[PDB]
From a paper:
We subjected SEC fractions corresponding to ρ-Rof complexes to cryoEM/SPA in the absence and presence of the transition state analog, ADP-BeF3. In the presence of ADP-BeF3, we obtained a ~1:1 (ρ6-Rof5:ρ5-Rof4) distribution between the two classes, whereas in the absence of the nucleotide, the equilibrium was shifted towards the lower oligomeric assembly (ρ6-Rof5:ρ5-Rof4 ~ 1:3). The reconstructions do not reveal differences in the ρ-Rof interfaces, irrespective of oligomeric state or bound nucleotide. Rof molecules are bound between protomers ρA-ρB, ρB-ρC, etc., but not preceding or following the terminal ρ subunits, ρA and ρF. In addition, loopβ3-β4 of Rof contacts the N-terminal three-helix bundle of the adjacent ρ protomer, presumably explaining why Rof binding is only observed between neighboring ρ subunits but not at the terminal subunits of the open ring. Thus, Rof bound between two neighboring NTDs of open ρ may stabilize their relative positions, and thus the open-ring conformation.
Bacterial transcription termination factor, ρ, is a hexameric, NTP-dependent 5’–3’ RNA translocase and helicase. A ρ monomer contains N-terminal (NTD) and C-terminal (CTD) domains connected by a flexible linker. The NTD comprises an N-terminal three-helix bundle and a five-stranded β-barrel, the OB-fold, that forms a primary RNA-binding site (PBS); the PBSes are located around one outer rim of the ρ hexamer.
Residue numbers in the entry:
A (entry chain D), B (entry chain C): 1 to 418
C (entry chain c), D (entry chain d): 3 to 84
Write the structure that this text describes.
Amino acid sequence: MNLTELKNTPVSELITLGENMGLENLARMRKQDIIFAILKQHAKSGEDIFGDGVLEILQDGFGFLRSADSSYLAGPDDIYVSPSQIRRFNLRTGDTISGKIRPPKEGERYFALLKVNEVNFDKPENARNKILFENLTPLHANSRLRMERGNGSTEDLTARVLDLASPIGRGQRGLIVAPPKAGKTMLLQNIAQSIAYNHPDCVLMVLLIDERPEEVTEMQRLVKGEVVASTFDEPASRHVQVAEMVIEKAKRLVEHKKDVIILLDSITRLARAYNTVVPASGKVLTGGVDANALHRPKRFFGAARNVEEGGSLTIIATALIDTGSKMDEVIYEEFKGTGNMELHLSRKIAEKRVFPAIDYNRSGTRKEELLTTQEELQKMWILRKIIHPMGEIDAMEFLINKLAMTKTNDDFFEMMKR
Amino acid sequence: MNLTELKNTPVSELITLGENMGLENLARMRKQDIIFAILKQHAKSGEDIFGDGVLEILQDGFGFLRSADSSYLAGPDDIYVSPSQIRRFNLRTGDTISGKIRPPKEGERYFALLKVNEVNFDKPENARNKILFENLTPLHANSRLRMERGNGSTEDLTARVLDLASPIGRGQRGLIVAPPKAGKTMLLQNIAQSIAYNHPDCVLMVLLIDERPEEVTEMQRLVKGEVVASTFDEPASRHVQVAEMVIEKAKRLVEHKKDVIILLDSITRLARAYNTVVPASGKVLTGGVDANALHRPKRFFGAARNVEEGGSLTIIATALIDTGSKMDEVIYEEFKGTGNMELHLSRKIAEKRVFPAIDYNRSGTRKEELLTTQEELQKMWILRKIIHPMGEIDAMEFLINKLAMTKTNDDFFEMMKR
Amino acid sequence: DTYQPINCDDYDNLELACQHHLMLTLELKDGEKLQAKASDLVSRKNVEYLVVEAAGETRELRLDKITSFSHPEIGTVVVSES
Amino acid sequence: DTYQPINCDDYDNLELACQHHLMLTLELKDGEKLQAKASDLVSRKNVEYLVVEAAGETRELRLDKITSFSHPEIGTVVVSES
């Protein structure tokens, strides 16, 4: 049967399937071992087995078709592709490969590819002729990703406030300065739903680094799209592997003229994982961070650009501030001027139990003339002008109750000018 | 006879029983050897012998049934389980096996299992069909463990302050930050007493790492349930083995739709033991702590979850700060944000002799809306708003004084409302 | 009717004969003398079965029906009911 | 008419023979025999070709027209047309 549907079924269904297939002692094994045993038993019959995944290329030369269902974790069910296929079809890291597979032979551990059917959601001949991501010329964001639901519900209120604070464009480089206990998680949640509703064409990618399992489960349950995660139980190498796989897949999708959105949670954890995993360079800055360590996350962060040829890759990451560790303070300090979109959250608003906790007087974008129209820009600047002298929490609640009875944004502007 | 009752028998009574049976020079022998000799003689008589123990599988593939009475210490009285039984019954580490034992033959210096009767307090057939703990989907904590005894005693004051500050839910990952001589032991003891009183159904586990023997005996005598511990005069491998056995037993109990609670004192000592035992990785963080060494404790601490299918594993661990060693500080720093529950004990409050020394302002929970009711949550928010502006010692003394003139939390809430 | 797990020592001796491929003389519940060559055993439906390729027909059977098994080299062990 | 890429295992075996540079047997669709040496496998314009020579001719041949092959070290594999 298809491999991608076996990884979506609940464990009880898989156990029942293996039991009625003739297998036993499957209950106490892991999910991946159950899948591998079921696949081997089915292939014993000799039927056609289909599968799909993302190619990860090891240092030796061969690759593995990791699956996004297990957040690109190594396991016995991964399909092994020899350098034969990497040389034959010019495949880089992150190419989505789908095709038939065969059971392992004697002396072979993992399953092997048999006949590639689609590469990067496209025919191999057209896939091998695409220009590499590095050769694509960067450009400023011009098309705006409007994230107003329009239903007028209380959930859309934070999205409307965010849109009035800092517009989001395709290919934008976003950074959120979220102090602890400032409602960052629900902000990411509503951003994810707004993106999944307003722009179904853009590919949504949410990756969690150094998070608790409950957050992973809730994100998988409520966010529609592709969500991968790396809990704090797994070592730093797992964080590095997940981040690299996601960014490579995003680049390979953008090369096919597609819009990709990546919500990074969070940048400081990835930087700390890189600092832990990198070899020491002999020069260590304050807080215990290596100079060469902090360069690795910049490759991830710098990939956000608007491709002139077609499509774009936008990364809306978040940072940690005043968490008590000077390492994260330094990491934020060096990530300061590297993003065109900045969103400032504050603890003072959150402790008053009024949401969202966006600091409007200090959060905004750069080169916003391209994203918005002329009259919209005029109204936004007028609203910023009137908000500017007011106090922080005062400006926030003024924005909240000005947006209370309003359903959309334009009518709010009309009643503001009145 | 039964091995468990012999292990529960006082040493003097064991000596008298052995002398009556026909043994000698038992007075100057270890308790394990006394039990071994008594069992060997009673087996020479020819009667059937029962026993039980938690399975630990060694490197080769055979297992040993360690006993919780001696904190799973290796001894001559442990039961040997051949790899045949582990292949026959699908048993993992932490499984509680109870059944008939067999006298050792020549060339063997351990008692052997004869016929299994119960596995994890269930029939052998039903134990093989339980889904693994890893495959179970985690969730947020939603069912609350009420700690308020409600009898109006002065001992219940700390439990009431706990319920007011950081509600405890089934599956909540709790961290209690405790400076030295801040009365942490009395807090853990009161929490264990309140849990054993209010919720007799859930399994209570107390884990002590690097603790003086008098504290171990105090915990063993006072705490209802079962207590395992490792005194500081033991190798780090002993602490590692004790922690791994405790967490495997907890996982195997959760697999059977049960609620288990593990009170750990302390996570810092467990992390230090893991650092000592682990092989060097080549990367050393600040304070002389290995980098990968902290991957093992997290797999312990991260095992706390609220399983959607059923059951729960609630781990509350104590962390040590201000101890004057950078190792403890960095260990705390790495475990900073992996817990759903946070509780900050205060040295400054403790030196003022008022108890419990709890810092209300810098303590709380994550997603407390799930555990409590709407009115209770509103009252708690009102109380936190009232307490927050004033000082710390003043806050604790005011809370204690207000809770003193009332019995239950509800009456205190009504009195505050007026 | 319900299958009963056999004692640990009997199972260990039977698996030792299976791995070492000994020449087993089998006495069934009725008492039939059979020349069983034991190779391996399986567990299905929470019931343990032993399969023997006696005369090449490879018959499977339950474990509670065996009164005794013997071998000229290894010590014979009577299957304990308890 | 339309070219069909060969299976991964067959392609891997053929380039294994190529890098090993071993003497090879070629069978065409009609069922003939060519005892010849394969030098390299080259893909051009989305169609892969292999250069095989009986006496140094270096003839370019398509991969789909191959029927089978045999050599004592590597078991014979028959390709699949669909």
